[PDB]
Design a binder for this molecule. Structure first.
Ligand SMILES: [Mg+2]
Ligand SMILES: [Mg+2]
Lengths: 354, 354
């Protein structure tokens, strides 16, 4: 065990929130609860169906916890899209999160992937069978271009998980490996492109804005998640391959140098996010800003990241960063700290049983 | 009005060839001619069929020229694969090259992409109809993992061309745009995974080296092409958007700074290629080395890049670069300089007419 870079972590986090202009919004707590319940309720009913229960090998409690985590991420980050769109994206991003629970070799189920796809025969791999069957409910919210992005990113993700099963951090000297893997399973183009429902944006009219957002949001989104996750992943001997840990193994640098690298990229990405979009179409900048703020709010509130622990340790320090941090945290809490009992019910297992 | 940095271009090129250990091989001129003709002959017959002629909107001379360029690229770089594999890969990489020609908005033909795909209905876009129908002939040479990589990369390429139609170099400040676009249309994972036919390599036994090769080869391959083809490019502004030009517009740097960036990446990529694989499975390193050398040999010989011009105007210099350069060039010429009349016949149009 090494000591956590609390000071360096608080500083980076604060700079991050300042760079993205983290601030209050009109998105109220009551509206969040309303959206959380709607999104959760439709998804829960979906995963509670016999077919879904039968083909999706997942521990019931893990499913319950995965669904609640994803519903939160979607509702808090895709703040500007309809309830239905939040619901359908919640189902999709829950399928992706759940695929990481499989240790099963994809090889045998992928031997006839293309031929079955071309012929329109159900896929051998159960996950593909469920996800492709459900996909139209996600794709109906987007134009052809954005849809293509969601389809590719998800295919990329499937290959990402396949690779993850080898718990390989890259060969020493394989500098290009880390980010290659991080893009493969980051779902960067899925997220980036799902921010533009055809009912709110015109894909052809904003093609350049959207394409640029996809390109830039891909890296901002995965790097921010890597950073916010750094605290929970620090002493987790079970989590052996992450962007930071692969930087260490592949680039042969220290965990600190690896963390610096991640920090420089994240901050620079944030800085350029604002510079590029602040003066563009107002609604495009709004969706982008609300996603960044929501995404951060979500990491701060979801127990999974345990950022509450950092808070408690530094809430009495009179340092500049410690102060700035606790403030942002408190802001997130006021609108985002919500008890699951207020929206996540009944449990999926209960609906499946009935 | 500007000047080709020649002096520097020679230096970079020489360092590149030295870094990758450019040297003679057992791959003889007669063997190349034998492969060129076999690959060309099968592809020419393919593209000459009524269905292919009818759905593939391409100027006959462009098709003839694209086919000859690709067959060369494949035969010289995938030196270790069977004749049949060279032929089928040539057909696929010719389809991709030809797609860069389309000026037609993909939007209307992609509105029902997923639903048609899921249902097994022929795609609305004629290119997809042809490429997907032919794909099995390419995929039969590979295991499920490599196949997945070819499929994804090709799907990415289709999106890449869609974006290319906007001739957009990225917003100033959108630092992540350039390489996002370059990977999108580089076919990096398609090339990198097609280097491992299941008849020569075992995808499960060499999963880690293959995955690593895909990750590293993706960047080496596109960057080397960007450097080599930087010549046939500033002269013209019909291809105004390129990695180097997008660096200029997006990063707001000078064409020279952009070129320096590309050079540092290309050399660093080459250096790491050798470091990582030189001591791994001998056969893996051989395929990787033969591809790099072949790929370079191909750029030096194919008229499309006009590197002969850089030659003539330097054969009488006395630099420690101009000298090194002409030497390598001459080496390439001895085994690669081949007259089309020796293998590319009869012309596709002739076979289509018959
Ligand atoms: Mg081109
Ligand atoms: Mg080029």
């Amino acid at each position: 065990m090494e000591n956590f870079p609390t000071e360096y972590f608080l500083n980076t986090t604060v700079r991050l929130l300042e760079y993205i202009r983290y601030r209050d919004s009109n998105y109220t707590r009551e509206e969040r609860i309303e959206n959380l319940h709607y999104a959760y309720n439709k998804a829960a009913h979906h995963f509670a169906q016999p077919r879904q229960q039968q083909l999706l090998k997942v521990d019931p409690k893990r499913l319950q916890a995965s669904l609640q985590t994803i519903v939160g991420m979607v509702v808090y980050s895709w703040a500007k899209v309809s309830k239905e769109c939040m619901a359908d994206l919640s189902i999709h991003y829950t399928y992706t999160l759940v695929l990481e629970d499989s240790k099963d070799d994809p090889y045998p189920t992928m031997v006839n992937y293309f031929d079955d796809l071309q012929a329109g025969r159900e896929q051998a791999h159960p996950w593909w069978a469920l996800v492709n069957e459900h996909f139209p409910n996600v794709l109906r919210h987007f134009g052809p271009f954005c849809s293509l992005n969601l389809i590719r990113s998800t295919l990329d993700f499937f290959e990402g998980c396949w690779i993850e099963q080898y718990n390989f951090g890259g060969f020493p000297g394989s500098h290009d490996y880390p980010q290659f893997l991080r893009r493969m399973n980051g779902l960067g183009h899925c997220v980036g492109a799902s921010l533009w429902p055809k009912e709110q944006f015109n894909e052809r009219s904003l093609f350049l804005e959207i394409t640029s957002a996809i390109a830039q949001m891909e890296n901002w989104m995965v790097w921010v998640n890597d950073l916010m996750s750094f605290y929970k992943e620090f002493d987790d001997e079970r989590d052996q391959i992450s962007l930071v840990k692969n930087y260490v193994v592949s680039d042969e640098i220290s965990l600190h140098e690896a963390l610096e690298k991640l920090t420089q990229d994240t901050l620079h990405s944030s800085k350029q996010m604002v510079a590029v979009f602040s003066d563009k179409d107002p609604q495009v900048m709004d969706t982008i800003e609300c996603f960044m703020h929501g995404y951060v709010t979500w990491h701060l509130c979801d127990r999974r990241y345990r950022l509450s622990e950092i808070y408690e340790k530094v809430k009495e320090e009179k340092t500049e960063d410690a102060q700035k941090f606790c403030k942002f945290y408190e802001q997130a809490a006021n609108v985002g700290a919500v008890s699951p009992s207020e929206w996540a019910y009944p449990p999926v297992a209960q609906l499946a049983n009935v």
